[PDB]
């Protein structure tokens, strides 16, 4: 029947443009299946990095009668993208910011048709914003939201004919999310402060001068924005 997604991925789906979705490291092709069942996209590519998710995606596409509309591919990151593909959206979800960043940078040659990027980061989204900036991408929307008590960020970006430089605060906190600072922004960064002060409970100041200087600088950045 109709697939139901979690709220994190449902929220991602609301940023899809019409056409093709390429879901990278897909969670068993459910986001592409949902997108087609709901008429958000026409066609899909589901990239799966290892055999288990690959085999599951193949079975799920077949079970939903979408074998002619979603192409399930085995490969890491953007390695699955083929030269003849027409891709309107690349989605990369359920990963840390640093991994999404690495996928985009390592795969940058696959971005020539300038698709919309919809990235859903679990942690440390700074790295992905730094990479987007390097790739002539511009953040056009951001969401911060909570599901099952965990806070997730969604970053929506499109290609710009000039590189868009972000400040240190915009990279760390988000150029859109800074404009709003919703209850989930405050909760996320309160939690991150608690984690940084907790690290200070574990590191002797005589033995960790360099590392503690970095932690204290980061605390001061967050305390200024809250």
Q: In what order do the strands lie in the sheet with 150-159?
A: 70-74, 43-48, 20-24, 89-95, 116-121, 150-159, 137-147
Please compute Rg for the chain using Cα positions: 19
Q: What is d(CA 10, CA 17) in angstroms, rounded to the nearest whole number?
A: 14
Buried b (16+ CB within 10 A) or exposed e, 163-194: eeebeeebbbbbbbbeeeeeebbeebbeebee
Inter-axis angle of helices 97-106 and 126-134, nearest 10: 20
Is 75 annotated to bind a ligand? Reply is no
Alpha-carbon dihedral 119, 70, 66, 38, rounded to 10 degrees = 30
Take residue 169 and report the two structure tokens written for it. 């605060």
Is 94 annotated to bind a ligand? Reply is no
Is 211 annotated to bind a ligand? Reply is no
Annotated binding site for S-adenosyl-L-homocysteine: 8, 76-77
Annotated binding site: 8, 76-77
Annotated binding site for S-adenosyl-L-methionine: 8, 76-77
């Amino acid at each position: 029947g109709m697939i139901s997604l979690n709220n994190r991925l449902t929220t991602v789906s609301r940023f899809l443009k019409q056409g093709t979705i390429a879901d990278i490291g897909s969670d068993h092709a459910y986001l592409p299946i949902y997108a087609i069942q709901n008429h958000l996209c026409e066609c899909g590519i589901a990239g799966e990095v290892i055999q288990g998710p690959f085999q599951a995606a193949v079975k799920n596409v077949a079970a939903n009668q979408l074998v002619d509309r979603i192409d399930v591919r085995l490969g890491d990151g953007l390695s699955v993208i083929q030269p003849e593909d027409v891709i309107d959206n690349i989605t990369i979800c359920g990963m840390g910011g640093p991994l999404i960043a690495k996928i985009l940078k390592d795969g940058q040659d696959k971005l020539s048709q300038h698709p919309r990027l919809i990235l859903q980061s679990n942690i440390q989204t700074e790295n992905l914003r730094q990479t987007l900036q390097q790739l002539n991408y511009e953040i056009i929307d951001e969401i911060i939201m909570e599901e099952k008590g965990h806070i997730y960020e969604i970053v929506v970006a499109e290609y710009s004919t000039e590189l868009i430089e972000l400040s240190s605060d915009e990279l760390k906190f988000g150029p859109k999310l800074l404009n709003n600072k919703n209850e989930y922004f405050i909760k996320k960064w309160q939690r991150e402060l608690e984690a940084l002060y907790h690290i200070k409970s574990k590191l002797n100041t005589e033995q960790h001068h360099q590392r503690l200087a970095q932690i204290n600088d980061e605390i001061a950045v967050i305390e200024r924005v809250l």
